[PDB]
Amino acid sequence: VLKGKRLFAILRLADGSQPPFGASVTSEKGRELGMVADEGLAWLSGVTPGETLSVNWDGKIQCQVNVPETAISDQQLLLPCTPQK
């Protein structure tokens, strides 16, 4: 039961901004880890270490998240929401 679970991700624009409330984080395969539901905190559910999330909100899929191998279960992990441009 502990490879992972569902987790608390902190998604942030590389600028210091936010994929903010409603930031749909789902990899380009549809690895739907979650969506921000306050500031820039998305209650994710099992992010795989080594992925490329896709983060969508008001401006939609604008940044994507680079998931490093330091991903973890049932804990907080802030992640790089890097713009496509």
Q: Is 1 a member of any domain?
A: no
Q: Which residues pair with 66 in a beta bridge?
A: 52
Distance of alpha carbon 54 from alpha carbon 68, whole angstroms? 14
Tokens, residue 8 = 């608390």
- What is the chain's alpha carbon radius of gyration, rounded to the nearest angstrom? 11
- Give the pairing type, strands 8-13 and 24-26: unpaired
Supply the CATH number for residue 45's domain: 2.60.40.2070
Q: Is 21 a member of any domain?
A: yes
Task: Give the chain's domain count.
Answer: 1
Provide the domain limits for residue 76: 8-83
Distance of alpha carbon 78 from alpha carbon 15, whole angstroms? 14
CB 8 within 8 A of CB 39: no
Q: Is 58 a member of any domain?
A: yes
Q: Is 3 a member of any domain?
A: no
Q: Is 2 a member of any domain?
A: no
Distance of alpha carbon 17 from alpha carbon 77, whole angstroms? 16
Tokens, residue 42 = 């998305």
Tokens, residue 60 = 């939609």
CB-based contacts of 78, cutoff 8 Å, min separation 6: 9, 10, 11, 12
